[PDB]
Amino acid sequence: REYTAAVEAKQVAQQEAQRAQFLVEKAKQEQRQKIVQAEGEAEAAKMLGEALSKNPGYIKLRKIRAAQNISKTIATSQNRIYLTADNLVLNLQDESFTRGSDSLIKGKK
Amino acid sequence: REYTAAVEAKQVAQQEAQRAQFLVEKAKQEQRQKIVQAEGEAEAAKMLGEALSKNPGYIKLRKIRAAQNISKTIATSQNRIYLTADNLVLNLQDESFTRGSDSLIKGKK
Amino acid sequence: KEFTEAVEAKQVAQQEAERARFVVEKAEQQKKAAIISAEGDSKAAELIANSLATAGDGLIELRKLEAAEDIAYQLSRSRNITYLPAGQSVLLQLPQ
Amino acid sequence: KEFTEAVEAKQVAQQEAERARFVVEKAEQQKKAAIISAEGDSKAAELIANSLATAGDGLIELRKLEAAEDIAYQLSRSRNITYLPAGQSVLLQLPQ
Amino acid sequence: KEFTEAVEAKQVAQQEAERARFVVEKAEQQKKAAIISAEGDSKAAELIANSLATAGDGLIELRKLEAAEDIAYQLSRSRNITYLPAGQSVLLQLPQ
Amino acid sequence: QQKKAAIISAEGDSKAAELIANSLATAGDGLIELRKLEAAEDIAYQLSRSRNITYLPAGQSVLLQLPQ
């Protein structure tokens, strides 16, 4: 079973070493394609880095809008979870109520 | 199957690269459409900063009103979020009653 | 079975390698498209960033408050969502 | 048979392209009108923001009261209500 | 029975040994090709690493925010997953 | 129109406030408390229908294991 199988495997492995350098080429083309897919991801990466790493203005607002896209997606989310209480600062009558978001005075944030 | 598919896909790929420049135009248009969704968001942003970076007043008041609205739709929310003891002070008799209600003092807010 | 399959794979792979040179071209074009769409989103975002940086954190927090209504709106289409205060020593114990 | 279905999908994509042309125009229009619908709701916000940056939270005190009546009737539906501490090292076990 | 089995194994071992020498050569070609698919991925990764090192952490955090939406999208196609604070004395429990 | 007499609606609510505010700042919670009792009767019937009424210590390093 494995004797003729291995001999034919050696011959087809000559053929497939030729076709495996050919795979170098073809999967190189699919490599550029997948590079380019994850590099549209990466151009999102660049764009957002240059835009919002100097100072996260919309990365602040995207902590926000993407915690809310996460929690516009928490519908699927059976997930038990825990945010923090001083996050939603449901501390309405508190000293640290607007320690949470008088951090709007930049420096606390 | 993948041979005829590949060749037809190469010809369709030439015509679809032309249509892909057309797609670049169409996606600049979608660029504008989502630019503007979050730029109505951003009109809110630019003005809310100019009116609150002075001192977060509607942001104080909108932590309060977003806590109120968060409660308000916690009503329909099954969420086993909570609050806890002693800020909305319903230790209705307490110093903390004058440290959650007198927490409204500026400096403590 | 691997001989004919290997020959057809080599032929289909040459067709796909030329088609995929043109698909790397298509991918540059489709990335112009995807960059510009994800940047519909994200250029809306950068103009929001400019608004909040020049004006301050106004709607940083106020879409952290308006969209915080989304928390109470949308947390418990499931049944176990909640939170836990910080600056403290919480004994976190998730529900069952 | 599947060739007709594939051509139909291609035509559907082309019709989405046309719809996106008219979304171009709709995008011009809500440029103007979404910027300024913001301007409206948002200037309710401008002045409340300034009024409060000067003094502090005035209207959801009175509307903790008024919106208590109304939308905290819409909260008297909220089955589980408790009321948080803070300023201390608060530590918690919570509902399952 | 082990007699014939082991003699057959000897002949199979000869053929497989020569086979596998050339499978190692074909695997030099295929290691290049697999490095190349992993290059699709990893060279997207080189350009991402360069992009983020040059431009800070924008999408380090914004695939932690934008594609953190994936966390809510996916975490819960089962019913016992969660995400929960720290920076405290969190004394984690996990459920039945 | 709401400019005028919503500023004045405030003026009403807000001088009920002013006088209570001077009242309690000078002395303390006087009718907040007497009507903590009277509103015990009334509003803590509205807030005894409040089912899981529970109290809590504080003033110390109080560490809470509140209801499951």
Curated annotation (Swiss-Prot), chains A, B:
Compartment list: Mitochondrion inner membrane; Cytoplasm; Nucleus; Cell membrane
Tissue: Expressed in myoblasts.
Residues modified to N6-acetyllysine: K10, K46, K60, K72
Coiled-coil ranges per UniProt: 1-48
Modified how: Phosphorylated. Tyrosine phosphorylation is indirectly stimulated by IGFBP6.
Induction pattern: Expression increases approximately 3-fold upon entry into G1 phase compared to other phases of the cell cycle. Also induced following inhibition of mitochondrial protein synthesis by thiamphenicol.
Stated role: Protein with pleiotropic attributes mediated in a cell-compartment- and tissue-specific manner, which include the plasma membrane-associated cell signaling functions, mitochondrial chaperone, and transcriptional co-regulator of transcription factors and sex steroid hormones in the nucleus.
Family label: Belongs to the prohibitin family.
SUBUNIT field: The mitochondrial prohibitin complex consists of two subunits (PHB1 and PHB2), assembled into a membrane-associated ring-shaped supercomplex of approximately 1 mDa. Interacts with ESR1, HDAC1 and HDAC5. Interacts with ZNF703. Interacts with STOML2. Interacts with ARFGEF3. Interacts with SPHK2. Interacts with COX4I1; the interaction associates PHB2 with COX. Interacts with MAP1LC3B (membrane-bound form LC3-II); the interaction is direct and upon mitochondrial depolarization and proteasome-dependent outer membrane rupture. Interacts with IGFBP6 (via C-terminal domain). Interacts with CLPB.
Domain commentary: LC3-interaction region (LIR) is required for interaction with MAP1LC3B/LC3-II and for Parkin-mediated mitophagy.
Official protein name in the record: Prohibitin-2
Species this protein is from: Homo sapiens
Residues of the full protein shown: 191 to 299 of 299
From Swiss-Prot, chain F:
S-S bonds: none
Predominant subcellular localization, coarse grouping: mitochondrion
Subcellular locations according to the entry: Mitochondrion inner membrane; Nucleus; Cytoplasm; Cell membrane
Induction: Expression increases approximately 3-fold upon entry into G1 phase compared with other phases of the cell cycle. Also induced following inhibition of mitochondrial protein synthesis by thiamphenicol.
Molecular function as annotated in GO: complement component C3a binding; complement component C3b binding; enzyme binding; histone deacetylase binding; protein heterodimerization activity; proteinase activated receptor binding; transcription corepressor activity
Entry's Gene Ontology BP terms: antiviral innate immune response; B cell activation; cellular response to interleukin-6; DNA biosynthetic process; epigenetic regulation of gene expression; mitochondrion organization; modulation by host of viral RNA genome replication; negative regulation of androgen receptor signaling pathway
Gene Ontology terms: cellular component: cell surface; cytoplasm; early endosome; extracellular exosome; membrane; mitochondrial inner membrane; mitochondrial prohibitin complex; mitochondrion
Annotated tissue distribution: Widely expressed in different tissues.
Modified residues (Phosphotyrosine): Y45
Keyword terms, alphabetized: Acetylation, Cell membrane, Coiled coil, Cytoplasm, DNA synthesis, Host-virus interaction, Membrane, Mitochondrion, Mitochondrion inner membrane, Nucleus, Phosphoprotein, Proto-oncogene
Function description: Protein with pleiotropic attributes mediated in a cell-compartment- and tissue-specific manner, which include the plasma membrane-associated cell signaling functions, mitochondrial chaperone, and transcriptional co-regulator of transcription factors in the nucleus. Plays a role in adipose tissue and glucose homeostasis in a sex-specific manner. Contributes to pulmonary vascular remodeling by accelerating proliferation of pulmonary arterial smooth muscle cells.
Assembly description: The mitochondrial prohibitin complex consists of two subunits (PHB1 and PHB2), assembled into a membrane-associated ring-shaped supercomplex of approximately 1 mDa. Interacts with STOML2. Interacts with MAP1LC3B (membrane-bound form LC3-II); the interaction requires PHB2 and takes place upon Parkin-mediated mitochondrial damage. Interacts with STAT3 (unphosphorylated or phosphorylated at 'Ser-727'). Interacts with CLPB. Interacts with CD86 (via cytoplasmic domain); the interactions increases after priming with CD40. (Microbial infection) Interacts with SARS coronavirus/SARS-CoV nsp2 protein.
Family label: Belongs to the prohibitin family.
Stated name of the protein: Prohibitin 1
Organism from which the protein derives: Homo sapiens (Human)
Name of the gene this protein is made from: PHB1
Residues of the full protein shown: 205 to 272 of 272
